[PDB]
Ligand binder design. Structure first.
Ligand SMILES: CCCCCCCC(=O)OC[C@H](COP(=O)(O)O[C@@H]1[C@H](O)[C@H](OP(=O)(O)O)[C@H](O)[C@H](OP(=O)(O)O)[C@H]1O)OC(=O)CCCCCCC
Ligand SMILES: CC(C)CCC[C@@H](C)[C@H]1CC[C@H]2[C@@H]3CC=C4C[C@@H](OC(=O)CCC(=O)O)CC[C@]4(C)[C@H]3CC[C@]12C
Ligand SMILES: CC(C)CCC[C@@H](C)[C@H]1CC[C@H]2[C@@H]3CC=C4C[C@@H](OC(=O)CCC(=O)O)CC[C@]4(C)[C@H]3CC[C@]12C
Ligand SMILES: CC(C)CCC[C@@H](C)[C@H]1CC[C@H]2[C@@H]3CC=C4C[C@@H](OC(=O)CCC(=O)O)CC[C@]4(C)[C@H]3CC[C@]12C
Ligand SMILES: CCCCCCCCCCCCO[C@@H]1O[C@H](CO)[C@@H](O[C@H]2O[C@H](CO)[C@@H](O)[C@H](O)[C@H]2O)[C@H](O)[C@H]1O
Ligand SMILES: CC(C)CCC[C@@H](C)[C@H]1CC[C@H]2[C@@H]3CC=C4C[C@@H](O)CC[C@]4(C)[C@H]3CC[C@]12C
Ligand SMILES: CC(C)CCC[C@@H](C)[C@H]1CC[C@H]2[C@@H]3CC=C4C[C@@H](O)CC[C@]4(C)[C@H]3CC[C@]12C
Ligand SMILES: CC(C)CCC[C@@H](C)[C@H]1CC[C@H]2[C@@H]3CC=C4C[C@@H](O)CC[C@]4(C)[C@H]3CC[C@]12C
Ligand SMILES: CC(C)CCC[C@@H](C)[C@H]1CC[C@H]2[C@@H]3CC=C4C[C@@H](O)CC[C@]4(C)[C@H]3CC[C@]12C
Ligand SMILES: *[C@@H]1O[C@H](CO)[C@@H](O)[C@H](O)[C@H]1NC(C)=O
Ligand SMILES: CCCCCCCCCCCCCC
Ligand SMILES: [NH3+]CCC[NH2+]CCCC[NH2+]CCC[NH3+]
Ligand SMILES: CCCCCCCCCCCC
Ligand SMILES: CCCCCCCCCC
Ligand SMILES: CCCCCCCCCC
Ligand SMILES: CCCCCCCCCC
Ligand SMILES: CCCCCCCCCC
Ligand SMILES: CCCCCCCCCC
Ligand SMILES: CCCCCCCCCC
Ligand SMILES: CCCCCCCCCC
Ligand SMILES: CCCCCCCCCC
Ligand code: BEF
Ligand SMILES: [Mg+2]
Length: 1000
């Protein structure tokens, strides 16, 4: 957390940095401080560049501006300013901490223009600027990968060794990949910048009157907005100081229900907005309307701006957040050994120094394939095209591999698991003091008062629209309804009073005038006569509200004068229905041991009811709600466990999650291990939960749809967006169709990308290593393959097999078993080692067998490697190795259970057959392609048949070796060291809870 400030030397550093030619790696290595120490020229008060460790290192420039002196710097989107009173930097977001509500009210009048200028210079513009970088900036930042440097070095060596064609191919691949990467990264950054941009004309009063109009960018905390009478997005965070408003906070909570925000209660005591959330207007939330009732207009004082806002925090978290495939020790040591052996034998076989250097360096490129990442990404490109053919669109194909090893999925409730809106579940008529049975659809009912009220009473508001749609009375005196009977026209109406949640309408028909009142249950029931209102109004209503539903009371009277003498006609119940495809998908995931979690901004009751309905909680499984009371400061916070109607499941609330994180760090892992519902979660709390679960060694994905769950999608390993706007920006994946079915197929696709990649990896390793071995053999006798032979091994065979072995698709089903995750696993290493023992055996045996012939004559070693050809050793070794490459490519690839069977991809098998056909033609057919490829045309037929038999033996041996390894290695692994006790943190916690269940 500590920091320091570093006050000619740049010229020396630039020369030294450029002269070293490798110090950039050392600077980019563990020790970068020296690189900054020399350049920065190492007080806090007097500095021009600051460095801070987060205990980690980060460097920032101490920006400055003139107002009468200011020194400030940005970090993670948060501004800090230097203060001379304490001679130190302070975060601007805490400049006015714990303002009293009366102090806020004292700013009822706006902010003076001079004070506006100085305060803008302090806080800065109200915009959230995304620092989009230029193309060279992106190149130096996100394309400094050392593999690209190695590829460039290998290319340069190959042009220095006359191997032009493959070097050109690798250069084209790397350049195109780099260009596409930079382009898409820039496009993503630009789109994010567009998404967060906001522009409005906002009114601000002044103490000199004449309330001016300014841009959203000019607002600073302390002036007050005159909220528009109609509505619109909120430019920043603010506190209502005069009037009431109805807001649509779907951006924070994910629900579109109107929310009432009243004025701030004037008085002493600090204003925090954690407890005054009901009196604060947040940035981005849409204002449905603003009614003053006092004074000329609604006034709301600004409190936060820019990154300080909730949207600011979310975007800041978004901006500021296999792996074992890059093992280093074995390859480095092997390359070193092979190199020193090459120099030893080469100096034993006298050849020029430059040739020795070129050969020894080229052996390194033989060892490490420069085409490996392209081979890795071919299958991900296949998977991306496959997904895009069925809706899901991806931006980072290499991310698809993470889908294979996914084991935990979080789901938003509204819009994702349930419809993005409420729907009529049914109406509950009551004749006397007893409710009649719930009616599924209100259309089939008599023409009594209840149906008339169901058809007429409305403000015509998605809710009334759904009501009118369900009742079916088509519109055609403020209206005339047609029953699909009698025509009921609306004779008079009244506005829906925001304070008293009533809406009354008086109607009449050709057949007395009658009033119908729609409102909240308890208040309207209180308006009604207790004679008709039943005894059990509290329980018939708690049965629905506790079950996540929202009830509305209908009252009536045959005609304040209107909503007086009333009798209840029924109750209309609304419900957020599960989408038709969520239960099958959820149960499909559950039967494969992929844990599903709900992370909602809704209340807990709706969350738990939906969780039970969709199958996340089986009917026989327990469920417990953990509640954490806030610390009173006399006694600490303490947890209380509440069971419900009755694998254990825990339903955690929103504030209680933060309480457990802050005051119970030790028990948080236990709760996270077996927690399934997280309700009333803030947009940052979703990201926090995702981060903690990832800290528990999980591979978490999320399928959010709304704006609130955008940071979580960015933080998740595999994020999926069901909305084509406001959330596709951050999500790696986006599905045009909006339901949970996108989740499983992606997982299936991911497994292919995680499985095929493994096979591809193995082949590449083998391709390199066997080639290395062959080179060594020839290097042992002052000979080399040949340029055309090298191209015919590197260009055609590798590219053909690598691309054609990636065509295979998934197996149409989700098994309970994940594919292997770590490339350095025992099975991978054992398979590679055994295959190479076989390959080395065949090559050395062939070499030692071809020497015992009457017709063999050794090459003369007085001549260089390429001028020794055509040559017996070269042709024999090339003939064996060329078949070996195809054998390895065929044996390495797999089929079920993660991919389709290996015999489906007819193109791959046909390619193998054709390549083997041309190779056997080269071995047998004399002098047809042996001009280009310097082969010596073995004349003895028996030896050629023996070579064919030997390579056939290698073929069958390799396939049988792979089969027996796959079908008998798990048994050996289990029988050795049976105390497995898997090292993953969540598995360890699961076992610990299994022995001793934490909730007693
Ligand atoms: C020289 C370098 C060699 C590297 C060796 C590789 C490392 C090594 O040993 O794996 C541990 C193995 C098993 O390791 P291995 O099976 O290869 O992989 C492990 C488990 O499979 C674990 O399984 P779960 O219970 O399902 O988690 C989990 O999946 C992790 O793999 P993941 O990437 O798929 O998540 C690993 O923790 O444990 C023994 O089976 C005893 C025999 C070990 C013999 C040790 C001799 C060295
Ligand atoms: C693996 C090895 C061979 C690395 C090869 C890297 C190349 C792919 C780099 C080297 C120089 C780069 C170019 C350097 C400069 C520009 C100028 C740039 O145009 C501008 O000058 C404006 C850029 C801006 O304002 O952001 C467009 C990209 C381009 C062609 C770059 C594209 C990518 C190039 C060709
Ligand atoms: C000459 C050297 C440098 C080798 C270059 C090999 C390329 C010619 C390969 C590499 C990536 C391949 C592509 C990888 C993925 C696909 C997706 C694939 O899409 C599907 O067939 C599935 C979608 C569907 O059918 O639903 C079509 C072929 C294509 C474009 C491949 C065509 C051939 C490409 C361009
Ligand atoms: C000097 C001599 C060695 C000439 C070598 C010419 C190469 C540039 C040719 C030979 C074989 C060709 C490959 C043969 C087959 C394919 C399969 C082809 O497959 C697909 O297009 C996708 C198939 C699918 O998606 O189902 C992609 C190009 C590729 C790798 C070809 C790219 C160009 C290659 C490497
Ligand atoms: C041996 C056979 C050789 C096969 C040759 C033919 C295949 C050539 C494919 C080259 C890869 C092109 O594909 C491009 O690769 C780069 C990195 O590799 C990916 O880049 C990836 O990482 C970068 C960051 O490093 C991310 O910003 C980007 O989102 C992500 O996808 C591009 O998203 C992918 O589109
Ligand atoms: C044994 C002797 C003769 C070999 C000497 C060759 C050296 C210089 C080669 C081998 C591998 C090469 C490096 C591989 C990785 C990196 C990191 C990259 O970000 C910059 C280039 C750089 C630094 C390469 C260039 C130089 C390099 C270090
Ligand atoms: C001169 C000496 C080093 C012999 C030559 C061996 C070189 C080529 C070896 C030694 C260590 C190796 C590097 C070790 C680490 C990584 C990280 C990985 O994510 C990309 C490949 C990369 C960058 C390797 C490429 C090959 C490498 C540079
Ligand atoms: C002719 C010799 C030098 C070989 C050059 C091959 C060229 C044509 C190769 C090199 C890299 C290749 C591209 C690499 C990746 C992609 C992205 C994929 O989503 C569609 C195909 C596409 C766009 C490829 C088209 C063909 C391509 C441009
Ligand atoms: C061209 C001449 C030499 C024939 C060579 C064909 C070889 C390379 C290929 C073509 C068809 C392939 C087989 C196709 C079907 C199956 C069943 C399945 O479990 C995968 C392996 C297996 C058993 C394959 C093994 C390798 C195979 C035999
Ligand atoms: C190998 O070297 C020479 C030329 O370098 C070549 O002509 C001849 O075949 C071989 N030398 C002998 C003595 O056979
Ligand atoms: C199976 C791979 C066969 C490779 C064929 C090589 C053909 C080279 C063309 C001829 C170039 C040299 C003629 C002077
Ligand atoms: N797989 C990368 C190895 C490439 N080896 C190519 C060696 C080319 C030899 N050229 C010798 C030039 C003789 N005039
Ligand atoms: C683009 C792939 C290379 C094809 C052209 C080169 C053919 C080999 C020429 C060998 C000359 C000795
Ligand atoms: C951290 C990535 C770079 C590691 C390179 C290892 C040293 C190579 C020889 C200098
Ligand atoms: C010839 C190099 C360009 C190949 C096409 C690049 C990507 C096209 C995306 C539609
Ligand atoms: C320099 C060749 C550029 C090819 C990629 C341009 C983008 C294609 C549309 C995504
Ligand atoms: C070299 C031309 C042949 C490439 C294969 C064509 C596609 C067949 C599988 C659909
Ligand atoms: C040359 C390798 C490709 C051959 C493909 C044959 C067509 C298969 C689809 C029926
Ligand atoms: C001794 C004559 C050669 C014997 C060859 C036996 C192997 C035939 C399988 C191709
Ligand atoms: C896939 C390796 C194929 C080896 C073929 C063996 C020769 C058979 C024809 C005599
Ligand atoms: C289940 C299919 C098993 C395939 C193994 C490979 C057989 C090779 C015969 C030579
Ligand atoms: F719409 Be979710 F419940 F945040
Ligand atoms: Mg939602």
């Amino acid at each position: 957390v500590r920091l320091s400030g570093y006050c000619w030397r740049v010229i020396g550093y630039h020369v030294v940095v450029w002269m070293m030619a490798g110090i950039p790696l050392l600077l980019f290595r563990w020790k970068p401080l020296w690189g900054v120490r020399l350049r920065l020229r190492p007080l806090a008060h007097a500095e021009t560049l600051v460095i801070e460790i987060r205990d980690q290192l980060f460097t920032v420039q101490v920006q400055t501006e003139a107002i009468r002196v200011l020194r400030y710097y940005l970090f993670q989107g948060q501004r800090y300013i230097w203060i001379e009173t304490q001679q130190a930097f302070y975060q601007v977001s805490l400049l006015d901490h714990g303002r009293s509500c009366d102090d806020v009210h004292r700013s009822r009048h706006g902010l003076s223009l001079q004070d506006q200028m100085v305060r803008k210079a302090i806080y800065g513009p109200n915009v959230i600027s995304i620092p989009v970088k230029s193309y060279p900036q992106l190149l130096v930042d996100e394309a400094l990968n050392p593999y690209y440097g190695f590829q460039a070095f290998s290319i340069a060596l190959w042009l220095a060794d006359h191997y032009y064609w493959y070097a050109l191919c690798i250069f084209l691949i790397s350049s195109i990949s780099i260009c596409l990467s930079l382009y898409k990264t820039r496009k993503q950054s630009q789109t994010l910048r567009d998404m967060v941009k906001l522009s409005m004309r906002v009114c601000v009063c002044r103490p000199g009157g004449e309330e001016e109009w300014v841009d959203s960018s000019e607002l600073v905390p302390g002036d007050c907005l005159v909220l528009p009478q109609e509505g619109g997005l909120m430019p920043c965070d603010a506190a209502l100081v005069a009037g009431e408003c109805m807001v649509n906070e779907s951006s924070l909570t994910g629900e579109s229900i109107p929310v009432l925000k009243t004025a701030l209660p004037e008085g002493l005591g600090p204003y925090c907005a954690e407890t005054h959330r009901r009196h604060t207007l947040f940035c981005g939330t849409l204002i449905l309307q603003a009614r003053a009732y006092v004074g000329p207009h609604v006034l709301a004082v600004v409190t936060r701006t820019g990154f300080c806002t909730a949207k600011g925090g979310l975007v800041s978290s978004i901006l500021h957040p296999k792996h074992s495939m890059k093992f280093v020790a074995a390859l480095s040591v092997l390359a070193l050994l092979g190199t020193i052996y090459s120099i030893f034998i080469l100096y034993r076989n006298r050849v020029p120094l430059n040739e020795i250097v070129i050969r020894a360096l080229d052996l390194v490129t033989v060892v490490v394939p420069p085409a490996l990442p392209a081979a890795m990404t071919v299958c991900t490109l296949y998977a991306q095209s496959r997904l895009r053919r069925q809706g899901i669109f991806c931006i980072h194909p290499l991310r698809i591999n993470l889908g294979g090893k996914l084991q935990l999925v979080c789901f938003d409730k509204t819009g994702t698991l349930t419809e993005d809106g409420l729907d009529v579940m049914g109406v509950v008529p009551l004749k006397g003091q007893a409710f009649l049975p719930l009616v599924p659809e209100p259309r089939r009912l008599p023409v009594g008062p209840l149906l008339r009220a169901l058809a007429t009473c409305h403000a015509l508001d998605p809710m009334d629209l759904k009501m009118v749609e369900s009742t079916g009375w088509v519109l055609e005196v403020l209206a005339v309804m047609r029953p699909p009977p009698v025509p009921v026209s609306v004779l008079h109406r009244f506005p829906f009073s925001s304070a008293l949640q009533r809406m009354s309408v008086v109607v009449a028909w050709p057949g007395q005038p009658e009033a119908y009142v729609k409102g909240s249950p308890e208040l309207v029931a209180g308006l009604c006569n207790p004679e008709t209102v039943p005894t059990d109004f509290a329980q018939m209503l708690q049965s629905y509200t506790a079950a996540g539903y929202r009830v509305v009371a209908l009252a009536s009277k045959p005609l304040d004068t209107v909503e007086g003498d009333l009798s209840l006609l029924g109750l209309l119940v609304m419900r957020n229905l599960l989408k038709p495809q969520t239960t099958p998908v959820i149960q499909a995931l559950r039967r494969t041991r992929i844990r599903a979690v709900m992370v909602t901004g809704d209340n807990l009751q709706t969350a738990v009811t939906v969780a039970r309905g969709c199958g996340m909680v089986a009917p026989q499984e327990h469920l417990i709600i953990v509640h954490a009371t806030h610390p009173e400061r006399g006694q600490p916070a303490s947890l209380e466990f509440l069971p419900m109607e009755s694998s254990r499941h825990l339903a955690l609330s929103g504030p209680t999650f933060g309480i457990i994180v802050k005051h119970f760090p030790k028990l948080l892992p236990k709760v996270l291990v077996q927690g399934t519902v997280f309700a009333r979660m803030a947009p940052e709390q979703k990201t926090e939960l995702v981060c903690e679960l990832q800290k528990l060694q999980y591979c978490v994905g999320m399928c959010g749809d709304g704006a609130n769950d955008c940071g979580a999608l960015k933080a998740a390993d595999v994020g999926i967006s069901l909305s084509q706007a406001e959330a596709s920006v951050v999500s790696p994946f986006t599905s045009s169709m909006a339901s949970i079915e996108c989740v499983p197929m992606v997982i299936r696709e991911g497994r292919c990308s995680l499985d095929t990649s493994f096979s591809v990896f193995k082949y590449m390793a083998l391709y390199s290593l066997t080639q290395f071995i062959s080179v060594l053999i020839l290097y042992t006798i002052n000979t080399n393959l040949g340029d055309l032979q090298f191209l015919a091994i590197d260009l055609v065979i590798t590219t053909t097999v690598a691309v054609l072995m990636s065509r295979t698709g998934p197996a149409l089903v989700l098994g309970r078993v994940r594919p292997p995750g770590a490339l350095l696993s025992v099975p991978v290493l054992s398979s590679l080692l055994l295959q190479m023992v076989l390959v080395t055996g065949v090559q050395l045996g062939g070499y030692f067998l071809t020497l015992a012939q009457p017709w063999f004559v050794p090459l003369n070693r007085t001549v260089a490697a390429p001028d020794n050809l055509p040559n017996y050793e070269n042709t024999v070794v090339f003939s064996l190795s060329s078949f070996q490459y195809l054998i390895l490519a065929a044996a390495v690839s797999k089929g079920a259970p993660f991919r389709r069977p290996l015999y489906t991809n007819v193109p791959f098998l046909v390619a193998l057959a054709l390549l083997s056909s041309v190779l056997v033609g080269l071995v047998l057919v004399p002098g047809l392609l042996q001009g280009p490829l310097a082969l010596r045309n073995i004349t003895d037929t028996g030896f050629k048949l023996l070579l064919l038999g030997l390579v056939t033996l290698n073929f069958v041996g390799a396939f049988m070796l792979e089969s027996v390894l796959d079908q008998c290695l798990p048994a050996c692994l289990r029988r050795l060291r049976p105390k497995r006790a898997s090292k993953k943190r969540f598995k360890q916690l699961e076992r610990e809870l299994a022995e001793q269940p934490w909730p007693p």
